[PDB]
Design an enzyme around this catalytic site. Structure first.
Site, short mmCIF file in Angstrom:
data_model
loop_
_atom_site.label_atom_id
_atom_site.label_comp_id
_atom_site.label_asym_id
_atom_site.label_seq_id
_atom_site.Cartn_x
_atom_site.Cartn_y
_atom_site.Cartn_z
N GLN A 3 16.24 24.78 24.07
CA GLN A 3 15.69 23.27 23.76
C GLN A 3 14.38 22.64 23.33
O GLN A 3 14.15 21.78 22.66
CB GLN A 3 16.31 22.33 24.95
CG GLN A 3 15.92 20.96 24.96
CD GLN A 3 16.85 19.82 24.04
OE1 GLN A 3 17.85 19.61 24.35
NE2 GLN A 3 16.45 20.05 22.87
N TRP A 25 21.23 11.77 26.29
CA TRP A 25 21.45 11.48 24.65
C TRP A 25 22.60 10.37 24.20
O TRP A 25 22.97 10.10 23.24
CB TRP A 25 21.51 12.51 24.00
CG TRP A 25 20.47 13.52 23.96
CD1 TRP A 25 19.30 13.42 23.39
CD2 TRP A 25 19.99 14.61 24.95
NE1 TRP A 25 18.28 14.48 23.61
CE2 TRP A 25 18.88 15.10 24.90
CE3 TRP A 25 20.82 15.21 26.06
CZ2 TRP A 25 18.45 16.32 25.32
CZ3 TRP A 25 20.57 16.44 26.74
CH2 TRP A 25 19.16 16.73 26.40
N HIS A 46 20.73 24.01 16.14
CA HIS A 46 20.57 22.23 16.21
C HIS A 46 19.80 22.43 15.07
O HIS A 46 18.74 22.73 15.18
CB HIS A 46 19.75 21.99 17.40
CG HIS A 46 20.95 21.63 18.68
ND1 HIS A 46 21.76 22.42 19.21
CD2 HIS A 46 21.18 20.35 18.98
CE1 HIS A 46 22.37 21.98 20.21
NE2 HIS A 46 22.03 20.60 20.14
N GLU A 61 17.98 18.04 13.08
CA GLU A 61 18.81 16.61 13.73
C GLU A 61 17.41 15.64 13.82
O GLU A 61 16.80 15.41 14.89
CB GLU A 61 19.09 17.21 15.23
CG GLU A 61 19.88 15.86 15.74
CD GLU A 61 20.14 16.06 17.43
OE1 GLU A 61 19.88 16.99 17.69
OE2 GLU A 61 20.87 14.89 17.75
N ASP A 107 29.24 16.27 21.49
CA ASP A 107 27.77 16.48 21.80
C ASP A 107 27.46 16.17 23.22
O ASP A 107 27.05 17.07 24.15
CB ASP A 107 27.10 15.64 20.82
CG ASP A 107 25.76 16.19 20.87
OD1 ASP A 107 24.75 15.80 20.08
OD2 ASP A 107 25.07 17.31 21.41
N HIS A 140 27.10 19.45 25.75
CA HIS A 140 26.13 20.03 26.58
C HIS A 140 26.54 19.84 27.99
O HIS A 140 26.53 18.70 28.60
CB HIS A 140 24.84 19.12 26.57
CG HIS A 140 24.19 19.37 25.02
ND1 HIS A 140 23.05 20.38 24.96
CD2 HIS A 140 24.44 19.00 23.79
CE1 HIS A 140 22.84 20.41 23.46
NE2 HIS A 140 23.61 19.41 23.01
N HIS A 146 30.74 21.15 20.25
CA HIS A 146 29.61 21.03 20.49
C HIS A 146 29.36 20.00 21.46
O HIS A 146 29.57 18.93 21.53
CB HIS A 146 28.71 20.50 19.30
CG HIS A 146 27.23 20.35 19.67
ND1 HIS A 146 26.41 20.79 18.47
CD2 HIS A 146 26.51 19.83 20.39
CE1 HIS A 146 25.12 20.36 19.07
NE2 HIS A 146 25.41 20.11 20.21
O1 LIG Z 1 18.34 18.72 21.02
C1 LIG Z 1 19.45 18.17 21.09
N1 LIG Z 1 19.92 18.29 22.57
C2 LIG Z 1 20.85 17.38 23.41
C3 LIG Z 1 21.64 16.83 22.50
F1 LIG Z 1 22.71 16.04 22.75
C4 LIG Z 1 21.34 16.77 21.15
O2 LIG Z 1 22.62 17.36 20.27
N2 LIG Z 1 20.48 17.50 20.51
FE LIG Z 2 23.53 18.97 20.88
#
Ligand SMILES: O=C1NC=C(F)[C@H](O)N1
Ligand SMILES: [Fe+3]
Ligand SMILES: O=C1NC=C(F)[C@H](O)N1
Ligand SMILES: [Fe+3]
Lengths: 423, 423
Positions: free
Chosen positions: A153, A316, A211, A214, A310, A60, A58
């Site tokens: 997102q 983030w 996701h 969270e 992540d 981004h 995981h």
């Molecule tokens: O919704 C999200 N976007 C980006 C992230 F890094 C986190 O995992 N959650």
């Molecule tokens: Fe994420």
């Protein structure tokens, strides 16, 4: 033209082992009764640990390396992070996404990571980052098998043309269908979004990575729908619930009931320790909750759980070098998996369990598999974790694709002495 | 015979600086308007960061390297840890304590640590570890200034002859008087033990470092007595409250009232991130509290707080390489000091703030001070922390006492490429 890996230690195994390589694959694995001599065409693990490659389940890559652009996430929350990302998303260009993704991918190659699952924000009519990432996937293929998640997102039902854009991303080639139920405007949209996600995954024969929950909301229970839909469709192996940080806040009775379904469903779970400890607990004063999902209990129940980084220097998360042993270190501490055996077996959370999460079909040190493996200059998982060792060699298709000459530390006492921090 | 440190970056300062050395001291510090050429007798910081030495304000060198002997701390709690240590304490020998302490001290020298405060358990009529540590202090003096805390691990009033043994330890030379009020049988013994601790510190002119409220008990408020007694005696600079993890569980109103006294008292605080995240929160199910004291609020209020490693492979902690940047990394995450500036200024928590905690009189890069400094191969505190860099050079008395040749990582793409994880 490597023919053998010698003097290799293997997790859970006693002694040393020799791994024979033929035509880019592992032809055989044989135990040694002593230390083998080095020779040309032989890569000496030097009694270090040999394991299949590290995995990043995981990350981004479309947002990596953008922290502070154009503004910083001041509150350190998921919600402000999405707002800061939206500002950056409006400034995306094809080349910029490719350059930043490649920067982090090179760090991953250096860190022995050969499998990566990147989420890419598809709440964007231009699908700029997705188009760039599809090219990066092809370009990096000789070194990393990159999976792309079409990640809506800003929601599927809560963003204009969200469902159409999610499907467009799959038609363009995304490997995995994403969702974010807790960010949808209502609980009903959250549940409905999951039915739509599963329908798309079955229509295109793709994996799913949500996701999921969270948020520090004890009422965020979208995970039960993810697991139930997977069980109904008999597709648990293809499904992943990322984060599930709300589970950290559930009462124990509901969690016990839920666990039966989680196990029966066969779905996978990803915890992201570095980011979770940072973004969760932000609405508490004191005491402050940790906010990582129930990793220890999942392991005890035989539910597949693994760790992701992540984010690497983005809205983030302001830190990182894309190092899985560092992610593991944080997770073991926050989840209190601090028994010797728990720490030693920690490597599974960044190797085998993650390979299962990505539904990998060619992974592991076994005859017939591609010769993809890495060598850690450590005696076992505990030692590798304690000393945060680099990857001495990364081998893919039987060829070395990365190597690290270890640092050399000396203290000058009455006489110079080499320090390796071992016992 | 080093005469100058050139091309040095300094925290909070712009540009490069030259540090002139004379007779083991820093004679002058001058700004550079560009990069200076290397020459014999010049140590080139190469635009790396130069800072006074790292400090370890809280470690247990008498217990280091004993994890699992004769048994492991299964529950991962402070209480079981003390029980497991008691079993090991009965097996102590002079040479064993010296050997284990020296093993960890060498790792500390390698990690640029030149100041260390070790607690030594004096709830032992034989004072075996103390006698050994007093010898180690003399032996390691050329490299590390070691302070010894006479730590009555099993209590002052709750252990046979506890007060007499604590005083005996001071008469033998311990530098600091310890206490552990929350482990005493009653609240009254806890408060009384502090009056006795302060009386001993004034009688012998010694510092004070109390293991204070290391428990997830919202009613454990011994810290207010430590601060009040220090204020009454006008000796805050000489006093330290270690842990204060109970503060993580206090209501906000009492904490606000308390903070006025903490500031007025001038006492120091030590947080031990690696151990606190592991031992605290063990009596919670879910959610689980983090358990570190209020570091962020202390910094905002101008209260001196710093970080210690506490334990290195012993009853209370199965990991560690005695690395302060690793301790800092954990603390920044758990305390959510994740803003860019907060991370960058993080170095203060393992340098200047810790020097104040140890009441050091010769510390810092300033003219007239001993030439004790270290060089990190990083641009600033943020960079050093993110990349977990080693100490390139450690200089003491104007001489190099440790050095680390950095690791070299290469990825083999279409062409070989060096990876340094920088941006
Ligand atoms: O919704 C999200 N976007 C980006 C992230 F890094 C986190 O995992 N959650
Ligand atoms: Fe994420
Ligand atoms: O009382 C204690 N003994 C040892 C430790 F490591 C912990 O600091 N607390
Ligand atoms: Fe301690």
């Amino acid at each position: 033209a490597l023919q053998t890996i010698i003097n290799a230690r293997l997790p859970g195994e006693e002694g040393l082992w020799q791994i024979h390589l033929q035509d880019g694959k592992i032809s055989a694995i044989d135990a040694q009764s002593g230390v083998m001599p080095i020779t040309e065409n032989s890569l000496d693990a030097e009694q270090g640990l040999v394991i299949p490659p590290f995995v990043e389940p995981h990350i981004h890559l479309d947002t990596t390396q953008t922290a502070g652009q154009p503004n910083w996430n001041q509150s350190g929350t998921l919600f402000e992070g999405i707002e800061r990302w939206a500002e950056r998303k409006a400034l995306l260009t094809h080349d910029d996404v490719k350059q930043r993704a490649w920067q982090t991918l090179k760090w991953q190659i250096a860190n022995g990571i050969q499998h990566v699952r990147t989420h890419v924000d598809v709440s964007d009519a231009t699908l700029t980052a997705l188009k760039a990432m599809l090219e990066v996937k092809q370009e990096v293929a000789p070194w990393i098998d990159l999976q792309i998640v079409a990640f809506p997102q800003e929601g599927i039902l809560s963003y204009p043309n969200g469902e159409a854009l999610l499907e467009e991303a799959l038609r363009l080639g995304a490997d995995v269908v994403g969702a974010i139920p807790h960010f949808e405007f209502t609980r009903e949209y959250g549940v409905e979004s999951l039915h739509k996600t599963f329908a798309l995954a079955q229509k295109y024969d793709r994996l799913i990575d949500v996701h999921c929950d969270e948020i520090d909301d004890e009422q965020s229970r979208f995970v039960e729908t993810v697991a139930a839909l997977a069980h109904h469709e008999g597709m648990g192996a293809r499904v992943t619930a990322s984060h599930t940080t709300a589970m950290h806040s559930y009462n124990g009775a509901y969690t016990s009931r839920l666990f039966r379904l989680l196990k029966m469903s066969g779905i996978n779970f990803v915890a992201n320790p570095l980011v979770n400890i940072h973004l969760q607990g932000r609405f508490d004063t004191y005491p402050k909750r940790r906010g990582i999902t129930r990793v220890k209990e999942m392991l005890e129940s035989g539910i597949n759980v693994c760790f992701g980084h992540d984010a690497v220097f983005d809205p983030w998360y302001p830190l990182g070098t894309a190092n899985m042993l560092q992610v593991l270190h944080m997770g073991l501490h926050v989840c209190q998996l601090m028994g010797y055996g728990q720490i030693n077996d920690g490597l599974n959370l960044i190797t085998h369990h993650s390979a299962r999460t990505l539904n990998l079909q060619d992974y592991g040190i076994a005859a017939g598999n591609s010769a993809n493996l890495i060598i850690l200059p450590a005696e076992n998982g505990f030692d590798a974790l304690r000393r945060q060792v680099p990857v001495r060699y990364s081998v893919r298709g039987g060829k070395v694709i990365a190597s690290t000459q270890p640092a050399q530390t000396t203290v000058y006492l009455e006489q110079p002495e080499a320090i390796d921090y071992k016992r």
